[model samples]
Target: IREDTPPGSVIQYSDYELDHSSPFAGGVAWIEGEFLPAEDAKISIFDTGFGHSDLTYTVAHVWHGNIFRLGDHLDRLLDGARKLRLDAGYTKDELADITKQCVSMSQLRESFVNLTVTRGYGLTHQVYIYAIPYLWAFPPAEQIFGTTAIVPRHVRRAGRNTVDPTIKNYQWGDLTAASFEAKDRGARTAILLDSDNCVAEGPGFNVCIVKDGKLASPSRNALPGITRKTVFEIADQMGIEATLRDVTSHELYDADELMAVTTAGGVTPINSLDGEAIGNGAPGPMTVAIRDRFWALMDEPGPLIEAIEY
Candidate 1:
């Protein structure tokens, strides 16, 4: 994992090259209209983004040198700013220009780009953008084989009344705790439930279940993930029944298969839930089909893809 501290370096874990070296080291960052090395990008301690979690950010990744759904992600970011009543003093076009500049400067063909809007030093708003080596929650091999997860008994996602999950803020207190619970249980990640014992979502992903040849995902108490939307679109293309509605624990545990969709991981299969085998303990046929189709779409030209020369 990368740490946002000086020398603004990253921690080495596996052979995945999740560190500051070579192509990754040469990444660029944009902050307050100044472009610099990502390591040097900094903000004041008094900023509300740091003092409080008063910030909204979005991450869009490049696939085959094209930024996937850049405009959609930007629209979401602008909507978040509007909801918070924070203005970064730039229009959508201006922000897009700056983002493209940063990406072009970095010269990274395939990378993870993060765009953040935060409450600045005074009453103003600040924009911080950067690009780094691409990251994945699970390695390529693990993603192909699938992963396991545990359901935290204690932690539940905050309802809309408490904190709007749709806003995409940095309020990860509950998620962090649930992650520890998963680790203790020897699972790759966690699946959080809502106060009503309904499946909400995961740390940074949305959960879905396949049952009787139909797909169902919780419509409330979860972030309306772009990847999740794509899954539904793919389902429609494949003539599969997909619904966005309440999903309970019973439905999840008894599903024919489980899947998770996220920007960072794409579509990943869940082979096990709470240590019990799910759908013969492997990535089901439908899960694999969706995952394959999702990646295939990335290689095709589409309006969602912003092709960059760099």
Candidate 2:
């Protein structure tokens, strides 16, 4: 200190605040014909995914070294790619093999894997794949205790005609703004509505309501999420009545319970909305029951699961 600085002088070094290393630096990635560390992966700035958001991606997680719903997620990814006219230069089976190879190379027991296809530079398309540490949209404690939400003003999900929500893309401009609006109003999340003032969905999740022992969700303006499909399957096994129909704001506010399902958070109960308590302002019994059942399914061997061989 005496040599580098004068007496009573404070020297602030900003270099320590910058982080050049990534947590995923050791993880594996596959781009084009090369396999490298995920942190080393890069795409062209002119790629349509970067320039125009013209790409589709699907994320699946591995639990206990087994990939959950790998087939279903891949099917959706390829279908979306096909719809968007982006070719990955590989068949469905070949893409599956590539995904498995990336996972195997990472050697992660639990992972969040993403596969993406983009309209690339020139007329060619590009495929980008990576595996990283698993992430939850909400913390474990929050998922257990439930969360709060707000209905934003004048912001609606883009209609199917404008941008098909069914196709999972990276376009989140509306969602990001809506989330900020919600947080400004003292909420943890936002639930967007359709142009008709009916409940649509949130950023990456599908919303549903339990009313008088029946489960129903908005059939339109929402992505048919894999997790939502799993919930229906689980409800059927449990003999719970579930349906998909148009759900309005009145019905949503009056429901016995509100829940959200997604690949990032699983089944999370909404305990409050717009500064009002939902149900008893806690996670309801049915919500807990279905969430428990969903977690249980992960432990059972199933056709949806693909085991990673290291």
Candidate 3:
């Protein structure tokens, strides 16, 4: 975060002497230019981020002390801010320092760090940042192998014309509806479809189906997720062809295999769709391989990783 440092390249920072011996030792936050405990990090109730949901965000993970694809996460966050016309109040490099500073202060080794920008109370927008111990979107067992998913009968993603998934916002109406439907139907999570009845994504992840050893996820309406990008790279390296196209719900139901790709869980297999078996009702070999490689890349020295300067 030095003046000469490259933007989003490194989170080289120190000297946030926040106490970590409290009951809230698990997390820390940077709000309005100051570091605070997670519980104490609060925003004005009238901020558009809270009242109107006029905000954008991105989450980056620190695994075993390294921030994975931090530059890309910052890239997405800035891109989202620009798309939403929300002021971030800092450049990418400054954001890196703010995020790393939170993790450094919290002293959490593996953390799920979230960065957010509101539309603002006045013209002066605000940035909210925090880091907590990483939590899986899927339960522990499902995180390891496969998770069950259900496509709700009528719930659909907000039309791209409405909110535009290209800009990751806090609008979760559709997802929350889908999630409740999923719960009522006895599923772990929901995979929402677009207005045209095509597979869009899940609550906190993206969905893709494998057919004849090839991959196809939604081309139009979904976040261009960080983990989704990593999946493509890993798939290419493994000689698996992946594509972005209009993936219909039928295609997902009939596919040989399916999975949700996200920062929360790299490549979690969808063993069953609507309580029906997908492929062999087990983690497909391709899914397992890609998942293993995704985590492996995070550990080994690679371009996608940035070590936290703690």
Candidate 4:
């Protein structure tokens, strides 16, 4: 594995190049690596992939050089591409192989990676693989022990009538706008609602609530997050009764335990909802139990990357 940035004074010579300084650093760049300047990395203005539409991007968190749930994320990516009518000609297995290769090449075993696929330069249609160096900042352990959230006015989540929220697509303006609006209110996340005013999901995470000693959360109109799925698995192992159901603002206060899961924030508990404390207003034992098991599972060995021979 290698982790070396191109010399400071590099030139752009290919369709794409990786920029370590920019937000995307650890991932592979399909562009000209030797020529592109470290700064001023540019893409065609008329690029159809993200010109005026939502740009799809996915990020995964790696701790101690271990990438958690990578296969789940890549599977979602391929499914998203097929839904958007952009056949990238790369299967999930192939993408995983390439991603592992990129990770090996960059020699960054422990860091965040942002994988982006954009419509490339073509009068009709073009597809390009764009990877950027991704950086993430987590709050102090105390804050992460029990995070807070805000309820935004934006309630409409991606649904069957509109966009399928299950697919992790690039278009996230709705979530982004809602998240910022909540952040302005001094909240770490924005718990969104569906058209029916039911709690759907957060910006890029899923919400779970504990009611009467049982865990529940909105099942529909949300992306099937890898972390979220893993949490369910954890619950199963611990014999915690967890179920998926429709949730509402009123249910937020009634929740005995509330937490969320995402790539960056794994198994984060929500102590306060919309500035009000949930239950005791601190991370509960159930939250800690799940979090502990989740981390412990990561210590296990992962699958080996065998370069597929055609």
Which prediction has the highest TM-score against the true structure?
3
Please provide, for model 2 over 1-310, each residue's C-alpha lDDT reduced to its tens digit, 9 standing for 90 to 100.
0012122312111121212263333377898778787778888889988999989999987655678898898889988899998887888888888888887777665667899999988889999998865666655555667888888885788877887887898898778888899889998888888888788899888898999888898898888889889999888888999998889999988889988888865788899989799999998888888887776666678787878896
Cα lDDT, model 4, residue 136: 25
Candidate 2 CA-lDDT value: 0.80
TM-score of each: 0.90, 0.90, 0.91, 0.78
Worst 10 residues of 4 by lDDT: 5-14
Task: For candidate 3, write residues 1-310 as lDDT tens digits.
Answer: 1112123322122223335466446788888888888878889898988888989999888776778888899999998898888768789998998888888767766778899989878668889999987767775466455888899897889878997876777888889999999999999889998988998888888987899999888888899989988999889998999998899878988988888987854678899989998988898888888887887776789799878766
Q: Candidate 4 has what TM-score? A: 0.78
Q: Which lDDT tens digits does candidate 4 get at residues 39-147?
A: 3345667776667453345666554455666777777776676676656656777766655555544434444555555555564333333333333222435324577
- What TM-score does prediction 3 earn? 0.91
Whole-model lDDT, model 3: 0.81
**lDDT (tens digit, per residue) of candidate 1 on 1-310:** 3322113112112122223453434477887788888778777888888888899888887665677888888889999888988887888888888887777667665678888999887678888889866677655554677889889978999887887777888899888999999999999989899999898999888998999999999999998888888899999899999999999989988989998888875888899999999989999888889988887776688787877765
Question: Model 4 residue 274 lDDT?
Answer: 80
Candidate lDDT scores, in order, read: 0.81, 0.80, 0.81, 0.63
Model 2: worst 10 consecutive residues (lDDT sum): 9-18
Candidate 3 steric clashes: 0
Clashing pairs in 2: none
